[PDB]
Write a protein that binds this ligand. Structure first.
Ligand SMILES: *[C@@H]1O[C@H](CO)[C@@H](O)[C@H](O)[C@H]1NC(C)=O
Lengths: 48, 130, 49, 98, 98
């Protein structure tokens, strides 16, 4: 049904068996994100 | 003292061409105790008159693992004509210069990929960003 | 910290007649900086850091 | 100095005094990569690339650089090591009376 | 000598054949099946050597990628060369021509 894939597509050994990948747009890995804690920031007051 | 500098040969016997710079490839002089490269090193000649030398580094560590899995042989030798390679009057020198002239058949080390150099040789997937 | 680095690519069916004649335009566009302009107009702009 | 990035970052992280830094905290402009040049239309080109991709999978590639490409001058938090203030820093106060 | 040397000499698959009973069995060939490496050392006599190559050459791990070196014992007088010696045999012997 298709002749070319144009979308974010990583590269790995299993997928490289059956198709070609040319050369990258841009280089990036992968990380983790968690919620911020800035609600629990260091506040201030006169009496502190 | 042997009449032959190197043993005569008897496509799994491939030639490689390398350049020396950065932690990627490091050149060190031979041990004077025995005149051989020590542990964790790959032999590498050097033209100009042939002198033995020891080559080691990060990039060479790749060439050990790749050649072991695909099961082929090699024998490195450093280049003796200029830097990585520059076109002058439609001629190629350096590491690129050897591969186009079929005297090398493969170059490893620290090359940089761009459009001009893909009109003569072919690269593979990059293994470090630059 | 980044722990498995690779890169998005354009994938095609094996041995199509464009295997090697497309990856020059991707590779040449980096020199012109054209890949940079697309970066600063679709990825990075105003934010709270 | 305008040179290849994969050499500067190693060099700027393994220098005494930690007095050298890359602008933009790791800024690169035209992103290309290193590689292994092979003779045109060689039969090996199909196997060498597959081998390299596998080294990503088992993490061998991602720990070798911890063995050859590490430094001590951490480029984190932008350590200033004092300011040693001068005339220039307090410019406005010498202007306020003016 | 191997232990007190910085060069990484290594040895494995040390073989020993029993040419005493001369049963004629393939105990030589069966033992040599588990062999590798391009350098193989030999230490025998000229008369008994011809049998050694025949079985070894029958397997074929002698043609291209394997080199054999023999001490001065298998030399004769360097005037006649008995057959079954593999091509490109390199060996040492007491000086004769000089
Ligand atoms: C390949 O690209 C060149 C660009 O100069 C073009 O002339 C040629 O027609 C292209 N061939 C194919 C098969 O796409």
């Amino acid at each position: 049904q298709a002749d070319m894939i144009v979308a974010p597509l990583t590269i790995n050994n299993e997928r490289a068996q059956y198709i070609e990948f040319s050369k990258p747009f841009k280089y990036q890995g992968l990380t983790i994100l968690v919620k911020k804690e800035i609600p629990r920031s260091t506040l201030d007051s006169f009496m502190q | 003292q042997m009449k032959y500098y190197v043993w005569p040969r008897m496509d799994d016997h491939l030639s490689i061409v390398t350049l020396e710079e950065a932690p990627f490839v490091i050149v060190e002089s031979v041990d004077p105790l025995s005149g051989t490269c020590m542990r964790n090193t790959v032999p590498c000649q050097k033209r100009i008159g042939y002198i033995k030398k020891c080559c080691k580094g990060f990039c060479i560590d790749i060439l050990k693992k790749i050649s072991k899995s695909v099961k082929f042989t090699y024998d490195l030798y450093l280049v003796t004509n200029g830097k990585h390679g520059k076109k002058i009057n439609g001629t190629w020198n350096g590491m690129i210069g050897e591969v186009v002239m079929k005297r090398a058949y493969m170059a490893v080390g620290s090359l940089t990929i761009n459009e001009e150099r893909s009109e003569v040789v072919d690269f593979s997937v990059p293994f470090i960003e630059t | 910290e980044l722990f498995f680095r690779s890169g998005f690519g354009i994938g095609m069916r094996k041995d199509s007649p464009w295997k090697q004649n497309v990856s020059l335009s991707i590779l040449k566009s980096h020199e012109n900086g054209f890949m940079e302009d697309l970066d600063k107009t679709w990825v990075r702009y105003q934010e709270c850091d | 100095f305008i040179y290849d990035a994969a050499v500067l970052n190693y060099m700027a992280g393994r220098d005494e005094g930690c007095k050298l830094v890359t602008i933009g905290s790791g800024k690169v402009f035209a992103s290309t990569g290193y590689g292994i040049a092979i003779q045109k239309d060689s039969g090996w080109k199909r196997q060498v690339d597959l081998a390299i991709l596998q080294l990503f999978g088992d993490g061998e590639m991602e720990e070798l650089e911890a063995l050859w490409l590490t430094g001590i001058c951490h480029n984190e938090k932008n350590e200033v090591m004092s300011s040693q203030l001068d005339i220039d820093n307090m410019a406005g106060v010498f202007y306020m009376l003016g | 000598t191997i232990e007190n040397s910085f060069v990484g000499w290594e040895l494995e698959e040390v073989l020993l054949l029993d040419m005493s009973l001369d049963d004629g069995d393939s105990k030589i060939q069966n033992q040599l099946k588990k062999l590798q490496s391009p350098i193989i050392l030999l230490y025998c006599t000229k008369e008994e050597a011809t049998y050694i190559f025949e079985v070894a050459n029958s397997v074929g791990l002698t043609g291209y990628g394997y080199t054999w070196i023999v001490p001065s014992l298998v030399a004769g007088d360097t005037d006649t060369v008995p057959a079954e010696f593999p091509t490109g045999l390199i060996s040492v012997s007491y000086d004769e021509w000089d």
